[model samples]
Target: SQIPRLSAINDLHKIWPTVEEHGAAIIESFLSLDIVRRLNEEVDPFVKIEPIPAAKTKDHPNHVLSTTTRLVNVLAPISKAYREDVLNSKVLHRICSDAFHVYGDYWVLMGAVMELAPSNPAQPLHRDMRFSHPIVEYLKPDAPATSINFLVALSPFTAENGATHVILGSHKWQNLSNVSMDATVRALMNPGDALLITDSTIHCGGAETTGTETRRLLTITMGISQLTPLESNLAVPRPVIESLTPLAQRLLGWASQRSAAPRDIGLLTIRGNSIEKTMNLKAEQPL
Candidate 1:
């Protein structure tokens, strides 16, 4: 389905209406189950590890779970369907257009799926990063730039379970420097629901309940084309890129520039699986 249209969004005042209307509208039962299963069965076994202590201890005290960086692409073992689904989600496209001045040869989507297994203390409210963009050092404060965060609810979110908190429109506050945890609002969502926030937004993960359940979420911070991805799939065999559809080749960053090697040229093609050999199929043949 295409992204749902949000009504009442003339300016920043309508932010809540927009979020309330479309923020979680993309949720689906089967999709949530698939993500959870994949994370548990395929990902956790390999990447399971403890989270560093929260930056603040006075108000927050819980261990975090950290997955590998840029996992969707690096985890080549994952079904291609998962990678394609996330990249092509209409909800994500809308988020990019509404939230940021997107551009680039490459964008990095990074963040871990955190689990707040019930703990002794709660974390102080916070946001992901304070910088407007990774290039903020070179740009003015008022420059039009953005960073978008998408939180996928893997478990049913509730106040008691320490749902992530957010302050609507706090991203636009004139004096964000002085704002603290008390200034943000706690947010809750159903399984598979998504929460999209920009760089300026104030937000934080909540504390889980004792002996209750774990809070699981897929947190993807997508940055628009700032620079070519450090992990470009260009190194992939030419045959591999040529075998896939044009869309796949582009997403994998394999369609850019000609190969430096004389054996492969610009817009090359290949036979046989150049990938990890996970699939068994004959090369594409004439129709």
Candidate 2:
């Protein structure tokens, strides 16, 4: 069966329950079509010239598709639309906060643009939280989500073009050793749509059988502030940081973990040089 599909304006009420029960859901028209086109235009240069290094089928045959897959990261500096729309997304922040309600705050964990070129194989299905495998706390079935993912459709996703594959309710399973492809469903989405999945969900990118169509997806990961982010979050450099909203800056981990951002947060302000002093913006500083 297909996952719950809600409209940004019309089906707004169903989003949480879908994630709560099924571990994932789709948000239709999460971004306007015009915005999607603009962001696609902004990212054309990078995805064309700098696709991710492809792992050989010999070593990681299950994890990666063939040479047909492409990826790139550290998006905020390159795309103004990405920074303005995605980095400052209140909806994303809201879901992350709700999923990790027990935590004080959360920040961006990592994000990337993934493209499935024509006629590629599918990626192996697995949980997102397994990144730190064997080093995990083995959370209970009802434990708070440690991470949340937004798989935004940059291009139309279809069965032939390799929409992502997922297994509902698998997020609550203790182990994924006995799963198979028959239990999965395709997360077919239109451009500008998004699939929200919790860290524990079982899922993977699907194969591309469409010889002429390339499917592009943008995956953004968010986690509680206490966890070390996959991306440095400080990698965007200073000038770009200066251009972001306070909420965006906080999401990028440029602000104090403390909500009020007191001056006594010595770790980031060791020598009495507040980021505010350096940038002339009201940001967190330490004693």
Candidate 3:
């Protein structure tokens, strides 16, 4: 069976429990229709011109038809909306607090929008935390989630339109060598819906958009302060950073880097209140 689907904001607590058991959860109407529409209008143009390059190989030399916009929060309106609706939302905060076991310190690692053009192939099934080196190897069987991912649908995510395929409870499987289509389920969602995924969950983007419409999705990856973000968000402009709320700034990695350490430490303490803070930090910190 597919994972649980929550319809009300009050039911958000159901996500962590379900994710702890099944590795994923779906929230319908996570965003309002108006916000979804506005995001599409603002992000579509950028994606059109800067489509991401596909995995190149001797057999598949052509670029993939999909497009991606990184650091989407750079846009003032999107940042404001995302902060108000997602980052600052009590439900999301509660989930993060419960999942990461850190209160008010979990941070956004990266934010981006991905649009899969028609006829796109399904991506290979894998874990999102595969890049974390030796730490990932130690997280076998049952380990607390170190990172969480959100896929917000800006367009309908139908079976034909490339909804993601997730293998139930695969987060507990140490050996991912044997994956079967029968073991996976589709995350069919409408615009404004959101899918929450544990980083260790085995999942992949569904292949083949037989439908005429493009599949646009906004992905937000969040982690405890100790982990490094997949993308370098420090490059975001100063003016844009200055415009965000304090909580937003912290979520964007502008506050403190140490999740478990004292809040006032070194440069993070000195510039925590200023927009002039530098992104440089110790790379050896535990993730």
List model 3 lDDT by residue over 1-287, tens digit each: 98679864868768788888888889888888887877777676766664245433334222423333122334433444664456666667777888886423577776777777777778778788664435756754666777888888888999887799999888777777668777999999999988899888888888755746678888887787766665555676555566666676677766654454455343345545433345442221211
lDDT: which is higher, 2 or 3? Answer: 2
Q: What is the lDDT of residue 168 in candidate 3?
A: 85
How does each model score on lDDT? 0.48, 0.75, 0.70
lDDT ranking, high to low: 2, 3, 1
> Which prediction has the highest lDDT against the true structure?
2
lDDT of 2 at 106: 77
Off by more than 4 A, model 3: 54-80, 102-104, 131-134, 261-287
Model 3, residue pairs in steric clash: 122-207
**Candidate 2, 31-135: lDDT as tens digits:** 888878888888888888863355453332324335666677778787787877887665666666667666557777777887777877888887775645334
- TM-score for predicted model 3 compared with the true structure: 0.81
* Better structure of 1 and 2 per lDDT: 2
- Full candidate order by TM-score, most accurate first: 2, 3, 1
Q: Of the candidates numbered 1 and 3, which has the greater TM-score value?
A: 3
> TM-score: which candidate is best?
2
What lDDT would candidate 3 get against the real structure? 0.70
